[PDB]
Amino acid sequence: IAARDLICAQKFNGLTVLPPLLTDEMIAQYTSALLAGTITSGWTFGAGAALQIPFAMQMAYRFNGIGVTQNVLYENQKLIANQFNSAIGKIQDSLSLGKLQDVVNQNAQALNTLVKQLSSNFGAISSVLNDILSRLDKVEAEVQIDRLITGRLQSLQTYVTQQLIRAAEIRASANLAATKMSECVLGQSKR
Amino acid sequence: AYTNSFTRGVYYPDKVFRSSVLHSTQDLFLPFFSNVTWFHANPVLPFNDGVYFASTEKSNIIRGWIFGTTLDSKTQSLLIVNNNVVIKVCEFQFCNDPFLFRVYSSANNCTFEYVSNLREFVFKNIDGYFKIYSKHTPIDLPQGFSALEPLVDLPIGINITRFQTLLAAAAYYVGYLQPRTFLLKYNENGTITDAVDCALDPLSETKCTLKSFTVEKGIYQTSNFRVQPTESIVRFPNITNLCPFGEVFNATRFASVYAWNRKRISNCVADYSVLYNSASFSTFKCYGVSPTKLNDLCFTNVYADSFVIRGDEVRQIAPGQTGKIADYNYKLPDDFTGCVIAWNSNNLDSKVGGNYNYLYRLFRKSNLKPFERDISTEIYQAGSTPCNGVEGFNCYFPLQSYGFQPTNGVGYQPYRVVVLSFELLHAPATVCGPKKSTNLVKNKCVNFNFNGLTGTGVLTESNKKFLPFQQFGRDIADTTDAVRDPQTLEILDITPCSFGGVSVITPGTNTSNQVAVLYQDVNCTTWRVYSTGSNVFQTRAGCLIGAEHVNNSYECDIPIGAGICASYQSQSIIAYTMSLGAENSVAYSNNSIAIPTNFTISVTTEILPVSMTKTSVDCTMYICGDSTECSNLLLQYGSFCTQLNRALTGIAVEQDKNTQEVFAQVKQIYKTPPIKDFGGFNFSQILPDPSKPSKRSFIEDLLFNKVTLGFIKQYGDCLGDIAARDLICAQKFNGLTVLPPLLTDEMIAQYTSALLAGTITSGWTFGAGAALQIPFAMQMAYRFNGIGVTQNVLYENQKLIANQFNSAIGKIQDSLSLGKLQDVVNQNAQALNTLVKQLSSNFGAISSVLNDILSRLDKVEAEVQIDRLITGRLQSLQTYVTQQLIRAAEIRASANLAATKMSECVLGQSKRVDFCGKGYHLMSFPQSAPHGVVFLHVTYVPAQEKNFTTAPAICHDGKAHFPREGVFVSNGTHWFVTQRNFYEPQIITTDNTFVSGNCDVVIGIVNNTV
Amino acid sequence: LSETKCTLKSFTVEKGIYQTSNFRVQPTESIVRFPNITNLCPFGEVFNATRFASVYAWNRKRISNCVADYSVLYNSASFSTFKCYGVSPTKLNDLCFTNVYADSFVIRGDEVRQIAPGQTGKIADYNYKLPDDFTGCVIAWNSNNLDSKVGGNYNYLYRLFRKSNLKPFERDISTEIYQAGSTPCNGVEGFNCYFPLQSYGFQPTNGVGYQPYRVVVLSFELLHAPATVCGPKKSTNLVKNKCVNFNFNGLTGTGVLTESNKKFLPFQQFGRDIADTTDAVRDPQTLEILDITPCSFGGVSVITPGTNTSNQVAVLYQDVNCTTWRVYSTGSNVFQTRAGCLIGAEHVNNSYECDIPIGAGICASYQSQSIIAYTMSLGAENSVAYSNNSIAIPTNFTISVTTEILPVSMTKTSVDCTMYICGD
Amino acid sequence: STECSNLLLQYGSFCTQLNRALTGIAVEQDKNTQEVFAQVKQIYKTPPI
Ligand SMILES: CCCCC/C=C\C/C=C\CCCCCCCC(=O)O
Ligand SMILES: CCCCC/C=C\C/C=C\CCCCCCCC(=O)O
Ligand SMILES: *[C@@H]1O[C@H](CO)[C@@H](O)[C@H](O)[C@H]1NC(C)=O
Ligand SMILES: *[C@@H]1O[C@H](CO)[C@@H](O)[C@H](O)[C@H]1NC(C)=O
Ligand SMILES: *[C@@H]1O[C@H](CO)[C@@H](O)[C@H](O)[C@H]1NC(C)=O
Ligand SMILES: *[C@@H]1O[C@H](CO)[C@@H](O)[C@H](O)[C@H]1NC(C)=O
Ligand SMILES: *[C@@H]1O[C@H](CO)[C@@H](O)[C@H](O)[C@H]1NC(C)=O
Ligand SMILES: *[C@@H]1O[C@H](CO)[C@@H](O)[C@H](O)[C@H]1NC(C)=O
Ligand SMILES: *[C@@H]1O[C@H](CO)[C@@H](O)[C@H](O)[C@H]1NC(C)=O
Ligand SMILES: *[C@@H]1O[C@H](CO)[C@@H](O)[C@H](O)[C@H]1NC(C)=O
Ligand SMILES: *[C@@H]1O[C@H](CO)[C@@H](O)[C@H](O)[C@H]1NC(C)=O
Ligand SMILES: *[C@@H]1O[C@H](CO)[C@@H](O)[C@H](O)[C@H]1NC(C)=O
Ligand SMILES: *[C@@H]1O[C@H](CO)[C@@H](O)[C@H](O)[C@H]1NC(C)=O
Ligand SMILES: *[C@@H]1O[C@H](CO)[C@@H](O)[C@H](O)[C@H]1NC(C)=O
Ligand SMILES: *[C@@H]1O[C@H](CO)[C@@H](O)[C@H](O)[C@H]1NC(C)=O
Ligand SMILES: *[C@@H]1O[C@H](CO)[C@@H](O)[C@H](O)[C@H]1NC(C)=O
Ligand SMILES: *[C@@H]1O[C@H](CO)[C@@H](O)[C@H](O)[C@H]1NC(C)=O
Ligand SMILES: *[C@@H]1O[C@H](CO)[C@@H](O)[C@H](O)[C@H]1NC(C)=O
């Protein structure tokens, strides 16, 4: 069963995956707290104590924010609510995400090619240590084992360098997402 | 009968002086915390790989030792005895009870002779050398750490498996040694004072990896779970006969070279030791295999080729030779695997008068191909004219005859030649060798040898169907994973027996010595662990052993994974689930609102790196030192140092650019105000202090002492032994240097003081051109208008606001008693230190010192080693440069963020949420720090809210009215209109209101009077 | 400037500052320090002995306190085999050797190929074996004139049967009968049992492959511990506080020798650092201990206005404090900064903007015409007339247009690896 | 293989380096998640009405 799993083929050769510290349920808990705060309090909770305010009055504030008078909202409340409900319905209808899948695909591909590069000779007489050691004595075997060692070390070094570059990219994206959460969800943006 | 050693038994591995260092070595050591045996006041004990001996005596009772295999007169034994120190190697005949001088009865021929309160000895036997280390120590085995020093090494050259003690009211101890890895500590004087056994505990593995005797609180990854092989297996086919050595090597008459003979070998056992008493070979050379492995292998397609040639043509039977025989008679491939055997036969093939029975080919149009035979007899044309049979002046008969007389020179004597060709380790094989098979063992980690293929692992029954011509099966990584048993013909799968990840959690060695272990691939709900215990907690990250579970939820202390953390509390380690935060709720309704009635002024600090250290490298000095030979060999890699230096120079200029674009935003320098009277606001703690050797403020001074880090280091400064501990001019004796920043710290402080003066005297006008003066209180009133509060609110609470600001700015300097800035320094130091440390690697050569290599080998033999060293060291430098580039990019991102923050938070008022602090931003002050910048953010925070009833609109007389600013609130009886961020009710009248409705459509309208 | 030109691989240089090689120093003279020994090594007793031992009971003797001048063998001894393993034959005259043993025996002509680290056969298996990590030399020569007698010399024996292979440098001198059929063999012989030892029959009229050969094996260690067997080199005086070339007991190198304060234990001769290079040594004659320091140290930089403007340059020595001789050349003007010592530029007292950055707040520029060094200026000095009842308000305005430039893309490339690496 | 394990010790300062880099990445990921999602330390209930 180890000859087809492709996961414990990785970890029979020393490659392992570590779990995240926060579980998906805890993340969903955080997002639910954010939604409850923004719906009940407006943008007050993002600056200290959360103050309650009726939702229609909050949307009137947000209309004053974009340069329209608040009586325009109160005279079209039902049309606005219907439009919002229909729009969210369309959003969930459409859902029947390649940016997120690309990261997973890249990580899997990197680990799999790392496993695959173990069949190279690197200039020796074979890529199997046991075959080399079954036929040659110590002095004649060091010369081949050293070539294999150098090849596999440079494989690992290449993998680590690529991982560092990808991590820097992901950090840039995470900083952008944090700023978006801070400025679009906890307040109204003018940019 | 049994005792415990703790840290007893350690010797100097080498004879080289070291001091102030930690060194890691592998040798045969007595394992830490092992059980030794106790003998009171003799028996015969084994001698496995070496012995640790100790004797606590008071009257010189222990006297000596005897070593050997059997202690009779059929083998040699070693006697060491005091009585005069006497050392002999003889064929002694010993007694059952030897005591001291009736120790032995006879002494046959000898090959070695030398007659000449806690005593510790170590004995070893390597390469015919009996090595002894010893030490004495004045005072139930005691405790402590002492290191034994080399005593003697004797060339006895005997085989030892047992030993015994010689006795004339004492005790002695016996422990056995195993190959281990130790981390020893040398002190200032060169004495070994401490050691760590790496293969004892996971904590010991962590200590050996960190190369330190202390560990800081955290969680560390250790080696994967390892399992040892229990036993060994041999499985060859069943064969009885012996290979036909007599028919090949003892044949009556051999063939001619031009018609060499070939025969196949199969179904036999290759036991060539039967040739030792009858055949001596002048040539025996093998190509694809070592001569010392032949007894362990099996061979697939075995052919033997025989012929006869003359004495000095034997050198032509080799893969790549030219000559008469190699060209026209017999050629070997370049990829030949086999053996060539030749021996002189002047007694059989020589006759008086001349033997003319052996021929060879002298003329041919073109060279043969490997293993091609040509037995033609057609005349040879050598003049480009017809050659129809007749001979002479153009035509020769191709074949010539050897003439072998008994009285020739050795170069013209007959030689018999055999060539054996075979294949190894790919297909089924019927010519095995003289090894004996054993039983087949399944479902255990064992050592196996299947038809010469050796390995380790677990064997299981398989379901694959090999074709008859296949014997092995390979995986995608090119390793064998299936095999066919050569006797039962069943097929087995081979699986490795090492699997699973392991981690160790520690609170710090300076706190406690207890640890927890996480097994990441185990479900205890279980035996794949080093040790079980009283408490075993199962998580979804693995199985944790050594920590107690609890049901309450704290914040995280040490992250373990999947929502579980650990901490240290009679005192134990506990595991819990991390809490996200407090549990709160909001009293929401459709006609209720809360409005603040008071406020607080808060000051918070933010820290950002701006720069890192600039370095340069002299590659010739790092790679070659000062060897002219190495310097001349390095020129064949010349296009690789300029590249590294270009990258480093780019980084070095980038750092100064970062500092310039963060701090030199204003080119006008504003002097500090001569009179400091700003509506009652105290700035003395952040303005420049002129009563110091610098112009740094109080807070800046507190900041600069909180980071531990430019200087001129002279040659005479660390000339001599002082270079062996500085750790800085150890770097720069190898070509690594640090360049100073272009702007000094005083200049940076000058820029920050100009910024503060501008912002305190001008507001935000100086960041857009000419700086215009304005009283500070009016500036604060403007900043209050900025966040949506009226300016009269500021003017009526000026004393309270000023007092709050002063107390808040005092709290910051109180608290200052910065790991983000220290991390950069630590990383930059560590990288260079490991670069210096990597110069002790061999990289595959015979030594890591150029001078040692060049003191013993000459040019041609020395290039082969110097080139390996050069490749390794170039790789080290390239790795360092790449990591530096990545870190520089990260620092550039941080510096750009700091520049934007200086431009938007300090030179103006920000509307972006949570960009210049927490709350509603008012204003910001920068301070300079080592390699970074610190921002003091001042924000407005509403407080002390109260409840009110609210309506969206008010209907007077059939018309709708809207507040036009703020909200309508009611305190139970009356209706007022107020502002959002501060309670300030007023009368609802026609100027604070506008009418744009008919009072028929607004939901929630409440009618009142205006 | 020439080093900069060679590094850039160009005959022109643009205005700026360039890093050059570190400050190098040449060694003045050479030193040799061996121990004091008078005697000559016993070549006659080993190579000229009347009778050697058998291969199964080979002989071994220790060599110490002598000088190895093997040129004395040229007059009398010709060798058919001489091979060395851990060292080159042309370096033997400059080295010292630590633990020297000589092992001697006699074998037949065609077995000499079996005295090597990884050989198989009768002698390598049952009689005499070498390690895989052997460091030493093997010497063999024909001796048909001494060990051959008419009718057959039967004094030399070897072992033909043994249960298992010998370990390296192991001797076996037993005489017990050998069991070859798995039946009791209590002394009697025949059809299952053999006496383990066989005898060479050496007659003068044999083939060269059946003639006697005398074999000596020398084993020693190099460059780790104290040594008493040295080559025929002559010592010189000890020189301190100068960069010299040294040869201490065969270990060669360069640097400065200084008196030390370390106490080696009697069994130690050298000392190492974390980098695994030798740092301390013990003089083999006075028994004092010296420290070895490299004599190359310090960074150097060159400031140039551009070769198309002028050929004159300034040099910054980054590890020198002229307030001074660790410089290539002195000059009329020398300026001391906290970045190093600058030689070839005139200091001035007025402050400009930066032109060429030097470090720690100092820049340089081209001024009859010379290079000048000053401290960069941060900008103009202004002030604000602040009071508690005053304000300034603009009365006019200006419209300004400014430019900003940003990169968006770079060039796209591809590679054919087979074409770059292997051509065709 | 014990032989390869004993031969690899002449390259011992190259595994710790790789592992340090990977550990840095691993902690960076958890930091990213915290700084994106755990912005508010107060947990608010979903409204009852
Ligand atoms: C009697 C023991 C002498 C050994 C002294 C110790 C080390 C000398 C090492 C190598 C020198 C080889 C000496 C044998 C003569 C070499 C052949 C020649 O003459 O060119
Ligand atoms: C005719 C039998 C063919 C040999 C069997 C096939 C393969 C065995 C390969 C090598 C071992 C035999 C080498 C000949 C003996 C020389 C070694 C010695 O005695 O010094
Ligand atoms: C050792 O002594 C025994 C007994 O006389 C003798 O047979 C044997 O040949 C001797 N061997 C050696 C090497 O001296
Ligand atoms: C070790 O060296 C120090 C100086 O480095 C010295 O003070 C101390 O006495 C020495 N220890 C001894 C001699 O035991
Ligand atoms: C060859 O045959 C002869 C005579 O039968 C025998 O004495 C000798 O030992 C044999 N040698 C080999 C190598 O078979
Ligand atoms: C094989 O035969 C062809 C034609 O008969 C000839 O040209 C060629 O030389 C031969 N090969 C060899 C190796 O002689
Ligand atoms: C070897 O013996 C076993 C019985 O122990 C038998 O099954 C097997 O067939 C024999 N060898 C081969 C190649 O079949
Ligand atoms: C562990 O084993 C138990 C018992 O079968 C099972 O319920 C559980 O799903 C397994 N996995 C974990 C993570 O506990
Ligand atoms: C607001 O808080 C301050 C304390 O900072 C207090 O002195 C003041 O009385 C409070 N105002 C009211 C109206 O309670
Ligand atoms: C400002 O604070 C300092 C620090 O305590 C204090 O000495 C000074 O008196 C304060 N300013 C005034 C005007 O009191
Ligand atoms: C407002 O009322 C809610 C419940 O109606 C209460 O929980 C809250 O504490 C009140 N506000 C204040 C400031 O007390
Ligand atoms: C509400 O306001 C009215 C009008 O100012 C006042 O008479 C009454 O006392 C207030 N009630 C409370 C609870 O403040
Ligand atoms: C307020 O509106 C209600 C609903 O039409 C009406 O009955 C009531 O009389 C109004 N109040 C006043 C004071 O006009
Ligand atoms: C061996 O001794 C003889 C006679 O004493 C002498 O002639 C010969 O030169 C010596 N050979 C050596 C010392 O190699
Ligand atoms: C050493 O002695 C033991 C027991 O006497 C024996 O089994 C082993 O074969 C001997 N070693 C050698 C290399 O003969
Ligand atoms: C060598 O001679 C010196 C005197 O020049 C003497 O001090 C020294 O002891 C001699 N050699 C040794 C090893 O002592
Ligand atoms: C250079 O030497 C002078 C003379 O002693 C000394 O005052 C100064 O501190 C040293 N360092 C620098 C950077 O000038
Ligand atoms: C303002 O500047 C313009 C020149 O751009 C000038 O023509 C105009 O007279 C100025 N206004 C006053 C009031 O001086």
Author numbering:
A (entry chain B): 844 to 939, 945 to 1039
B (entry chain A): 27 to 67, 81 to 122, 125 to 141, 157 to 172, 188 to 210, 215 to 243, 262 to 618, 632 to 675, ...
C (entry chain C): 296 to 618, 632 to 675, 689 to 745
D (entry chain B): 746 to 794
Q: What does the publication say?
A:
The S trimer glycoprotein is responsible for binding to the ACE2 receptor and for viral cell entry after cleavage at the S1/S2 junction and S2´ sites. Receptor binding destabilizes S, allowing S2´ cleavage, leading to shedding of S1 while S2 reorganizes to mediate fusion of viral and cellular membranes, enabling entry of SARS-CoV-2 into the host cells. The furin cleavage site is a four amino acid motif located on a solvent-exposed flexible loop of S7.
In our analysis, all BriSΔ particles exhibited the locked conformation of the S trimer we had described previously. In the locked BriSΔ structure, all three pockets are again occupied by a small molecule. In our structure, LA is bound in a bi-partite binding pocket where one RBD provides a hydrophobic ‘greasy’ tube to accommodate the hydrocarbon tail of LA, while residues R408 and Q409 of the adjacent RBD provide a polar lid coordinating the carboxy head group of LA. We observe two motifs stabilizing LA-bound locked BriSΔ that appear to be characteristic for this S conformation, namely the H-bond cluster formed by R1039 stabilizing the trimer interface and the cation-π interactions between R634 and Y837 stabilizing the interaction of S1 with the S2 of the adjacent trimer subunit. This arginine residue is stabilized by π-stacking on Y837 and thus connects to the FPPR of the neighboring subunit. Fixed in a rigid position through these interactions, C840 can form a disulfide bond to C851 which additionally stabilizes the FPPR. The cryo-EM structure of BriSΔ evidenced exclusively particles in the locked conformation in which RBM binding to ACE2 is obstructed.
